[PDB]
Design a protein around this ligand. Structure first.
Ligand SMILES: Cc1cc2nc3c(=O)[nH]c(=O)nc-3n(C[C@H](O)[C@H](O)[C@H](O)COP(=O)(O)OP(=O)(O)OC[C@H]3O[C@@H](n4cnc5c(N)ncnc54)[C@H](O)[C@@H]3O)c2cc1C
Ligand SMILES: Cc1cc2nc3c(=O)[nH]c(=O)nc-3n(C[C@H](O)[C@H](O)[C@H](O)COP(=O)(O)OP(=O)(O)OC[C@H]3O[C@@H](n4cnc5c(N)ncnc54)[C@H](O)[C@@H]3O)c2cc1C
Lengths: 472, 472
């Protein structure tokens, strides 16, 4: 009647669903508990996969509705948007990738239980399904992958109809004629670009003086904001939000002020997206009874082998500290279940890439010029514009640069920052180079194809090691 | 007018113009000679850059003139083609990239002499313009970057109007109702897909039984063929050409025969593309006088320092052996002039990547399954479909795979073969890996961002190291 297992994973997010497959392949009789009807967690159901699809489709619309396709001799008339099919394709891809996780849990002999899991004891988790029936799992180890949730703004309640979160902004029924986005982070900037390409008047408000979020280079952030501001993205940065009111007009009066409070304006929008961030989700789990406290932000503190104060209970993902990105949770899930099977658990979050999937794309691996200034590390700067990269000018996407930072003495690649085309696929090369402890010269002396956008990466590294690049 | 110089470079091709800039940066009084009106060589004026530009715009057209855009809700009414605007984007990019080399040549203080170069002496080069001063360049070292030319077809005279080659096919005024391409290699497959997307009955005739030329993996070339055949491409592999006639109608009859015998057919077409291959160019160079004999293929025999029989005379590029690729010539040009400065010259023609810039893309590096069996090496195979990659299923590019080959004992990556989206930029990661001598497990344990097409590279390496993949 109960389930006896070795590793029980509370969560089907990226950190959890991978760890279940991995632990299953390593011999561990694995069990995964998921509360939501669909598997995949945020990234699949209401996260990376939906946002990327609309980002992709919105760009192709903005190209047809703009001079882009006519510039290349693709002359069309009456370019119109059927948001239904665009949202349908988003749903079709999410639905298809939900079924992938199911097929994987099936062929990799993982047991799925559709309930809300609470750690009843040090070696048992009880999951309450929607019917009220409880499935008691008795397990040797327990992995906490409860994931994350949206941080609510004080004084505003997301109704997911006109005051929406990321969840609602991925399923808007018609293009808002005006949209205000609180939070110029990754999700905010991305989602704002999707709807603005479809005709929305998007203005993003941020208390901070930079767009992008934590970990972006100041030079990259500024140049990124400029290109977006010329695409139609209006940015009210250094601006504090005071309040909001769901007018009887159907619209939402948004009251804003400066961080100092000097200028007090009020803007009005058809749709308000609150994207001030996300936070660790640890509700109704049983951590207080187990006597494991959280940290100030609400994260479960862990060690190198990713276990809490109770050793047989492990925790990975957005729940624990570190960059709340999908691939990070995946890795953490892999190293953790390998540490359980006997392995050297070592992950370097400095080699963790970050990708803004806008167009222009922003993507970086390593330390910013400012992070190194704080740490006192003296460095060199190498830069190659995509205006001088061959495949860019052949494709006409000649916006942005690749900035390579390297220590003066060691020439070691400290950080890499890419603004422009194909930056997302590019950082995975800079990631491999960072893991291999490469220098700027080490990359420059590698055969890079022609014509590719990777040549900007090689030549920017060359601009650091040699001082001068070839084609710039 | 004599020109006292340190290093004189004959040819503005990729191997020449890069080495001229590099040698000038190394301190040499570098001189470059070009017989044509524009710099850049074959790749920039009549090669990679123009072919890639049309491939980009033509793929964009085929998406609109089909179902791709409307599948995502991007609904246009009537799609037309202004070919005299697409060819302009091709020309505008080539012109801009040509002017780039000019500014760089002037920046690094390289002497551009516009004449036909011939080696009058061991330390003397004389260039004859069509009419001019017939400049003498007394130099210490001489670099032969004389390049390549269109290998002709015996029995077929290239008209460049209806009997076109790489050049003429890139500058056609109208779309042929039916086009026939001789040579199903890289250049053939690429340009054939350009006009097929633009509306043409394109058939490719090949003596060999594989597309993509020499080096491509059998399974990859075969799978590439299947997809190309669903996109309208027609392939007459294992078929020899026996004649071509220009009729008074202006059409061309092609006399084809099954190489073994029989299956003799006549093919009428509007335009004939002859791109069976290319051969080095050593014409009117003075090598016979100097005594530099050539191998049977007409290439210049060079040593590891890329010297000819006479040391001060060096040769690099398509004029020497190795794959006829521009990034090969670029690297060969750099390491050569650095060998003059005293640096060690080392080059591995296995870490040289090959990319077919079609949709779907083909890009590989290392050894094929056939080549590994030809050298008696036992290997593991790892595959990951792009149909399982998150970013591909998101962008609806669920076509192709990544194949990883690693020795059954050392697990060292021996060949990485990519068919599908983003292969052109993804392959440069495998180049860095092979240069760093990585194993399948080395790449698999590196953080790859989500969602990126690079995850297919990681997962395929895992499918060869662990045997099983996470998401497949
Ligand atoms: C709009 C948006 C776009 C994003 N884009 C990107 C991007 O491009 N790249 C990127 O790297 N990251 C992106 N992210 C972030 C990424 O989605 C998250 O970092 C990651 O998915 C969270 O990993 P996780 O498994 O720890 O959390 P989750 O995915 O939230 O996993 C938790 C899962 O477990 C369930 N659960 C929780 N508690 C219990 C319980 N007690 N019992 C049973 N089940 C439970 C939850 O319902 C959920 O399904 C994006 C996020 C959003 C919101
Ligand atoms: C359609 C097409 C697509 C291609 N795509 C790719 C691709 O994607 N990637 C890739 O790597 N390669 C590609 N190539 C091949 C690429 O163009 C060549 O491999 C490369 O350009 C040759 O290098 P090189 O240094 O010999 O330059 P070349 O251009 O071959 O060198 C010859 C140059 O020297 C000049 N010259 C010749 N004789 C003299 C003389 N006596 N005096 C002065 N100057 C002289 C010529 O005018 C020319 O400018 C493609 C080729 C074609 C036709």
């Amino acid at each position: 009647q109960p389930i006896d297992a070795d590793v029980t994973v509370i969560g089907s997010g990226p950190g959890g669903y991978v760890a279940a497959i991995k632990a299953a392949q390593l011999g561990f009789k694995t069990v995964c508990i998921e509360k939501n009807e669909t598997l995949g967690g945020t990234c699949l159901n209401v996260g990376c996969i939906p946002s990327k699809a609309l980002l992709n489709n919105s760009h192709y619309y903005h190209m047809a509705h703009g001079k882009d396709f006519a510039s290349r001799g693709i002359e069309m008339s009456e370019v119109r948007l059927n948001l239904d099919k665009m949202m349908e394709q988003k749903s079709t891809a999410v639905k298809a990738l939900t079924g992938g996780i199911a097929h994987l849990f099936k062929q990799n002999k993982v047991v799925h239980v559709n309930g809300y899991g609470k750690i009843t004891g040090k070696n048992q988790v009880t999951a309450t399904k929607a019917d009220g029936g409880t499935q008691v799992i008795d397990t040797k180890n327990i992995l906490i992958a409860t994931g994350s949730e949206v941080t609510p703004f004080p004084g505003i309640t997301i109704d997911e109809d006109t005051i929406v979160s990321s969840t609602g902004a991925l399923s808007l029924k018609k293009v808002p004629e005006k949209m205000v986005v609180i939070g110029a982070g990754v999700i905010g900037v991305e989602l704002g670009s999707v709807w603005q390409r479809l005709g929305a008047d998007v203005t993003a408000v941020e208390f901070l003086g930079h767009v992008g979020g934590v970990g972006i280079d100041m030079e990259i952030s500024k140049n990124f904001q400029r290109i977006l501001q010329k695409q139609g993205f209006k940015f009210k940065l250094n601006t504090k939000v005071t309040g909001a009111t769901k007018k009887s007009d159907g619209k939402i009066d948004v009251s804003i002020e400066a961080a100092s409070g000097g200028k007090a304006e009020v803007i009005t929008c058809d749709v308000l997206l609150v994207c001030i961030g996300r936070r660790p989700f640890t509700k109704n789990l049983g951590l207080e009874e187990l006597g494991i406290e959280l940290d100030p932000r609400g994260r479960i503190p862990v060690n190198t082998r990713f276990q809490t104060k109770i050793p047989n209970i492990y925790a990975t993902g957005d729940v624990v500290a570190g960059p709340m990105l999908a691939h990070k949770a995946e890795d953490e899930g892999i190293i953790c279940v390998e540490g359980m099977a006997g392995g050297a658990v070592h992950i370097d979050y400095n080699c963790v890439p970050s990708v803004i999937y806008t167009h222009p794309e922003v993507a970086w691996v390593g330390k910013s010029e400012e992070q190194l200034k704080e740490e006192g590390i003296e460095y060199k700067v190498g830069k190659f514009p995509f205006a001088a990269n061959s495949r860019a000018k052949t494709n006409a996407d000649t916006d942005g640069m690749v900035k390579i930072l390297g220590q003066k003495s060691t020439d070691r690649v400290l950080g890499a920052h890419i603004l422009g085309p194909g930056a997302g696929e590019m950082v995975n090369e800079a990631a491999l180079a960072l893991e291999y402890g490469a220098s700027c010269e080490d990359i420059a002396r590698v055969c890079h194809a022609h014509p590719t956008l990777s040549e900007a990466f090689r030549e920017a590294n060359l601009a650091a090691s040699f001082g001068k690049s070839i084609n710039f």
